RNA sequence: UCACAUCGACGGGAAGGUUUGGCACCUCGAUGUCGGCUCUUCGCCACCUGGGGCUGUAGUAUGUUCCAAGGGUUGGGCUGUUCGCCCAUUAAAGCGGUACGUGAGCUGGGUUCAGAACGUCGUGAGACAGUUCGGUCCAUAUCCGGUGUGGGCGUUAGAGC
RNA sequence: ACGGUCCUAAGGUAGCGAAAUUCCUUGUCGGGUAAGUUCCGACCCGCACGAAAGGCGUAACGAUCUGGGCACUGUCUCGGAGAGAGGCUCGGUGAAAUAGACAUGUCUGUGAAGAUGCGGACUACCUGCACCUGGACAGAAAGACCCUAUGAAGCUU
RNA sequence: ACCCAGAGCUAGCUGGUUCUCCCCGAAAUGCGUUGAGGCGCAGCAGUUGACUGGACAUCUAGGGGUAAAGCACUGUUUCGGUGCGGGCCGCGAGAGCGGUACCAAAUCGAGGCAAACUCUGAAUACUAGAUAUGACCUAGGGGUCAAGGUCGGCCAGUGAGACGAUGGGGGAUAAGCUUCAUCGUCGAGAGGGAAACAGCCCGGAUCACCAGCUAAGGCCCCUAAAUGACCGCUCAGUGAUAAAGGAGGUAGGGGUGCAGAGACAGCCAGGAGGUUUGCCUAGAAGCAGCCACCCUUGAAAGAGUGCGUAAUAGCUCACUGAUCGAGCGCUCUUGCGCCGAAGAUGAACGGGGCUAAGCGGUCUGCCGAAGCUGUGGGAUGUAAAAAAACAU
């Protein structure tokens, strides 16, 4: 009734190395910000963009990230600064942060 | 015993049997056919035993075809043994059949006799099958 | 675990030896008691010849325990399986014995 | 008589009838006489 | 001759919780482990005894299976043994649950202490559901529960039959 | 019985052998009994006897182990009767372990999965005394088994 | 050995740790550990400072390879057609070769499968950016409140989790089993529904009222509310408990075959000569197995669906006349029932009981919680203090 249990020859792994897209498409970046840790060139380097020893793709300039279409079934990544970025005190966020600030000041 | 010939990997998961079988609905060879309703894990012993019993009632002529081939393995662990310590060896191979799938096809006998035959072949199997004429 | 084959197929040869013994030994009702003297010994040497196989097997597995290929978990498994197998083919010895013992009265 | 869970006609002169929730096959034969199920 | 008197291959589907397991949920400020004695009771999946259908039922004697659990289901040899085999019987020598019923009822042969030995494993101390001989079984019944047996009161005025 | 070949320091001589050693196993054969998993003699497949951790025999001796017989009987079939010491009643003296509180039924269901206490039923005036032990997971000893503690202690190389 | 002393030895171990009210309120996870029932740091509490704006809601943009699907790749696979190459036989016995009851590469056509396959590719989720004024005052002014994070100081517990839904793994797609991922409840949560019943459903207990409305669930009696309504269904005590299979039980729907030039079921009728048929000559003779499955005589008949024979013989059923005179025969589909359905102290739907007081569908009343409403009282916080609210 009490038979022996056979050992395995498995049970080894490496904890997920945390690759993938760090800075997404149409998003803020920096000079030096790592955009993608990819194991090979899944995405390819575009304009304004360095490519490192590990095929790590990082931005050289400010601006928003762009994942372009390369030609025959591949992907690029370029970075573009943005011209004018308007802010209106009309809006809800602007209204509410000024309301909050004014409450803070009013209390103390 | 319709066993697969040297597959990729030894042991594999159970998954499950959602959905209706869409593809194996059509009939190719036969004019009459046995079709499944409830999903099940059909061993090769059940297939072979259905094929034999259906063949016995062909008699004078008319050809029979099988349209389900097991592929998936199943392991029972070493009998009377505690939990854990790896998987077991695969005992038998099974066909994952879903609802509305062809199991056996037959042509070239009188509709009298085919229907009689598939009753036996239904009786050998673990599921509520049904008779279907189309081709 | 290549002992299984060696221990296994020799039982067939043992059965064949028993059958060869039964081939040679083929009178009044008191004289059919005298054939039970020689017929018994065939069965006895059959049973001894079954036993000696399992003796060889367990003698191998003792060494396989000391040499440290297996351990005390696997020796119980193999002991169980060969306990089953050796007493499985002893029922064949008993059955073929009954084959010959029922022929003295009937045929 | 038989007491099967399945009660089918065996003789071609066999019947089926219900007396007190049963299903009884009555033939002209004695051997095809069966009850239940 | 004939699947369906009687068996039923390859296969399929159930219930039961008596076996061997899996789990580790109550109990480690203790719920005594086997077998025997004593004394129960209950279940039916019926060993015999009552009443049936079918029979490859001439009768006798069966085989099979339906109803039925009221009653019954011996005495020894061997083994600690339950189990088992055997002798002499017999209508028959049913199978299970109840903490594998019952140790604040009994027993202590088996198995879980210390001694000692054989085989074996161990360089050694020691070890081995391997074997052998020897080895302390508590209790004045509070309550429930039971078998008996009183007393009070009740039964509408009180009594004896 | 007879040879071939390998390894090893060397491959068990005499004797004994299913034994206090034997797993398989109630080995098989014969004796003993109506029937004998124990017993006696023989076989040898000695799992894993073996020559001073002696080998094998041996008259005697044993609150030694283990089989069989005669005599003997309540050991038993299968109980029965009687005598004392208690038990029982009366008077005198007068403990104990135990004890959350106790107004402390049975059935089945439920629940930390085995309920006097929770649900539904059933049963049941209140209260002594004699007897009986099935339950209160009754009492007794912070399990002696099992495992844990970077606990303790003996003993070994 | 004992006795005294070091010595209140140490014990990551067990037990125990005493007055009251108010406010907030966890965790049972990750990481490391001679560590696994301990500890450290993170995560999640409290408390007190600093920095700002989010939160919930809707709408865009991003990269995903999962469910799905698919067979172009990687494997796997069945059948057919083309068929290199292979199996076996035949020759004027060393040059030479031809047959071929045959297994089959590679492509083509049809047809499947795949956690570790993808020419494809959802929903969610994740990241980012955008847009919207939550409750109380005469479309704003000025008001009152509630409403989330980041950083740091001081100072905790936790680090045994459990069940349920889903996605999976292990197991036997067994377990009140085990291990992860996302969410609910318990844990730490009373109350009502579930007979009793942590974990299911409803709902979050500041306190008082012999007021009211409702949620979940219910309205024969035990026991609050309809022995309410209208239309269907069951005949089983189903309504409490399980399958394969069995079936003129009963109700409805559609489709399908014949039928007062008369069907169905009963009812005397007919149901033939070569057919001893060729066949393995022992016989298969309408009926072991073979094929052929004639055509005549005809109101009709198959060289035969079954019984009966060594094979014949014989008995039927197909069909058709005749008698007869109205709806009947064979499938499909459901709805609600029956059998299949047997265990140990005693009935077990909660009980009584019910033919509805059960099931289905619809319509309206009512009951029903500590939920919400009303009426009063307390304490917090919004500042400091009182009134006044808003929230708690």
UniProtKB/Swiss-Prot annotation, chain A:
GO molecular function (one): structural constituent of ribosome
Shown segment, full-protein numbering: 59 to 166 of 194
Main subcellular localisation: plastid
Compartment(s): Plastid, Chloroplast
Any one Gene Ontology BP term: translation
Complexes and interactors: Component of the chloroplast large ribosomal subunit (LSU). Mature 70S chloroplast ribosomes of higher plants consist of a small (30S) and a large (50S) subunit. The 30S small subunit contains 1 molecule of ribosomal RNA (16S rRNA) and 24 different proteins. The 50S large subunit contains 3 rRNA molecules (23S, 5S and 4.5S rRNA) and 33 different proteins.
Family to which this protein belongs: Belongs to the bacterial ribosomal protein bL27 family.
Keywords: Chloroplast, Plastid, Ribonucleoprotein, Ribosomal protein, Transit peptide
Record GO cellular component, one term: chloroplast
Gene it is expressed from: RPL27
Function: Component of the chloroplast ribosome (chloro-ribosome), a dedicated translation machinery responsible for the synthesis of chloroplast genome-encoded proteins, including proteins of the transcription and translation machinery and components of the photosynthetic apparatus.
Record has Amino-acid biosynthesis as a keyword: no
Annotated spans, Disordered: 1-18
The protein's name in its UniProt record: Large ribosomal subunit protein bL27c
Curated annotation (Swiss-Prot), chain B:
Record organism: Spinacia oleracea
Principal place of residence: plastid
GO cellular component terms attached to this protein's record: chloroplast; mitochondrial large ribosomal subunit
Function as written in the Swiss-Prot or TrEMBL entry: Component of the chloroplast ribosome (chloro-ribosome), a dedicated translation machinery responsible for the synthesis of chloroplast genome-encoded proteins, including proteins of the transcription and translation machinery and components of the photosynthetic apparatus.
Post-translational modification: Partially alpha-N-monomethylated at Met-1 (10%), whereas 90% of it is blocked to Edman degradation, probably by trimethylation.
Gene coding for it: rpl16
Protein name: Large ribosomal subunit protein uL16c
Entry's Gene Ontology BP terms: mitochondrial translation
Record carries keyword Metal-binding: no
Presence of keyword Ribosomal protein: yes
Cross-referenced HAMAP family: Ribosomal_uL16 (MF_01342)
Keywords, sorted A to Z: Chloroplast, Methylation, Plastid, Ribonucleoprotein, Ribosomal protein
UniProtKB/Swiss-Prot annotation, chain C:
Subcellular location, record wording: Plastid, Chloroplast stroma
Key words, A-Z: Chloroplast, Coiled coil, Plastid, Protein biosynthesis, Transit peptide
Residues forming coiled coils: 49-96
Transit peptide keyword on record: yes
Tissue-level expression: Restricted to photosynthetic tissues.
UniProt keyword annotation of Protein biosynthesis present: yes
One GO biological process term: plastid translation
Entry's Gene Ontology cellular component terms: chloroplast; chloroplast stroma
Main location: plastid
Gene Ontology molecular function terms on file: ribosomal large subunit binding
Subunit field text: Modeling onto the 70S ribosome suggests it binds to PSRP1.
Role description: Responsible for the release of ribosomes from messenger RNA at the termination of chloroplastic protein biosynthesis.
Additional free-text comment from the UniProt record: Expression seems to be light-independent.
Family membership: Belongs to the RRF family.
Protein name per UniProt: Ribosome-recycling factor, chloroplastic
UniProt source species: Spinacia oleracea
Swiss-Prot record, chain D:
InterPro entries in the cross-refs: Ribosomal_bL36 (IPR000473), Ribosomal_bL36_sp (IPR035977)
GO molecular function, one term: structural constituent of ribosome
GO cellular component, one term: chloroplast
GO annotation, biological process: translation
Pfam families the record matches: Ribosomal_L36
Signal peptide as annotated in the record: none
Superkingdom classification of source: Eukaryota
SUPFAM superfamilies: Ribosomal protein L36 (SSF57840)
Location(s), subcellular: Plastid, Chloroplast
Keywords for the protein's UniProt record, in alphabetical order: Chloroplast, Plastid, Ribonucleoprotein, Ribosomal protein
PROSITE patterns tied to this protein: RIBOSOMAL_L36 (PS00828)
Family as reported in the entry's similarity comment: Belongs to the bacterial ribosomal protein bL36 family.
Job description of the protein: Component of the chloroplast ribosome (chloro-ribosome), a dedicated translation machinery responsible for the synthesis of chloroplast genome-encoded proteins, including proteins of the transcription and translation machinery and components of the photosynthetic apparatus.
Assembly description: Component of the chloroplast large ribosomal subunit (LSU). Mature 70S chloroplast ribosomes of higher plants consist of a small (30S) and a large (50S) subunit. The 30S small subunit contains 1 molecule of ribosomal RNA (16S rRNA) and 24 different proteins. The 50S large subunit contains 3 rRNA molecules (23S, 5S and 4.5S rRNA) and 33 different proteins.
Protein name, UniProt field: Large ribosomal subunit protein bL36c
Annotated source species: Spinacia oleracea (Spinach)
């Amino acid at each position: 009734h009490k038979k022996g249990a056979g050992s395995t020859k498995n049970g080894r792994d490496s904890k997920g190395q945390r690759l993938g897209v760090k800075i997404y498409g149409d998003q803020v970046a920096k000079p030096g910000a790592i955009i993608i840790r990819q194991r090979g060139t899944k995405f390819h380097p575009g304009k304004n963009v360095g490519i490192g020893k590990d095929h790590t793709i990082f931005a050289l300039i400010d601006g928003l990230v762009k994942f372009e279409k390369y030609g025959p079934d591949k992907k690029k990544v370029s970075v573009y600064p943005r011209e004018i970025q308007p802010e209106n005190p009309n809006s809800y966020r602007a209204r509410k942060r000024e309301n909050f600030r004014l409450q803070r000041e009013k209390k103390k | 015993m319709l066993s697969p010939k040297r597959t990729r990997f030894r042991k594999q998961h159970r998954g499950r049997m959602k959905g209706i079988s869409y593809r194996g609905n059509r009939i190719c060879f036969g004019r009459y056919a046995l079709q499944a309703l409830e999903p099940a894990w059909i061993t090769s012993r059940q297939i072979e035993a259905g094929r034999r019993a259906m063949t016995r009632n062909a008699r004078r002529g008319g050809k029979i075809w099988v349209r389900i081939f097991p592929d998936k393995p199943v392991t029972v662990r070493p009998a009377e043994t505690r939990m854990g310590s790896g998987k077991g060896s695969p005992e038998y191979w099974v066909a994952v059949v879903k609802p509305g799938r062809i199991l056996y096809e037959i042509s070239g006998v009188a509709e009298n006799i085919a229907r009689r035959a598939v009753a036996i072949a239904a009786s050998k199997m673990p599921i509520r099958t049904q008779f279907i004429i189309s081709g | 675990s290549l002992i299984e084959t060696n221990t296994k197929q020799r039982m067939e040869k043992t059965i064949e030896t028993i059958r060869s013994n039964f081939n040679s030994v083929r009178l009044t009702s008191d004289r059919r008691k005298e054939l039970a003297k020689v017929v018994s010994k065939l069965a006895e040497e059959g049973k001894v010849a079954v036993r000696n196989i399992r003796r060889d097997a367990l003698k191998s597995y003792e060494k396989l325990e000391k040499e440290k290929k297996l351990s005390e978990d696997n020796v119980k498994d193999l002991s169980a399986d060969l306990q089953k197998l050796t007493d499985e083919y002893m029922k064949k010895v008993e059955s073929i014995y009954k084959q010959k013992e029922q022929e003295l009265m009937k045929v | 008589m038989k007491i099967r869970a399945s009660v089918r006609p065996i003789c071609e002169k066999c019947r089926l009838i219900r007396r007190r929730g049963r299903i009884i096959v009555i033939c002209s034969n004695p051997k095809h006489k069966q009850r239940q199920g």
